[PDB]
Write a protein that binds this DNA or RNA. Structure first.
Length: 117
RNA sequence: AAUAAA
């Protein structure tokens, strides 16, 4: 079967509550491995938290496990999304695949990512 | 899903 490129150790987060600051994501994502950086970009229209953020770790198996355990999860009483960044450039100009959510999230929702080896 | 504000 097909799969996304070797891009790892990074995760986008969206749908955040108005209180999910950097220390909140640091405590919400640490049980899966060991975090190494966090990001809280503003809306840059009124200089306030836009409701989305980023996470990074020193290991790739932690980031992939959070896609398997924190995708469509819930923070602050509301749903949130977790996934590796889409094909738009990232904070360091790195390129990425298209990340089509139909097939990728279908194989992450099914047990097929663990039955195979 | 993002306009990656340290």
């Amino acid at each position: 079967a097909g799969h996304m490129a070797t891009t790892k150790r990074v995760l986008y987060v969206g749908g955040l509550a108005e209180e999910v600051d950097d220390k909140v994501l640091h405590a919400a994502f640490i049980p899966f491995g060991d975090i190494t950086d966090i990001q809280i970009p503003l809306d840059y229209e009124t200089e306030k938290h836009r409701g989305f953020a980023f996470v990074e770790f020193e290991l790739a198996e932690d980031a992939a496990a959070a896609i398997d355990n924190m995708n469509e999860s819930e923070l602050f009483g509301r749903t949130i999304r977790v996934n590796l960044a889409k094909p738009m450039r990232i904070k360091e100009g790195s390129s990425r695949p298209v990340w089509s959510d139909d097939d990728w999230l279908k194989k992450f929702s099914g047990k097929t990512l663990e039955e195979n080896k």
